[PDB]
């Protein structure tokens, strides 16, 4: 499906916890 969209479940949700 994504590519980058799991990198971004990683951290960027984390970024701004």
């Given at each position: 499906e994504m590519r980058?969209?799991?990198?971004?479940?990683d951290f960027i949700?984390?970024?701004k916890k």
């Open positions: 980058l969209s799991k990198f971004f479940r949700l984390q970024r």
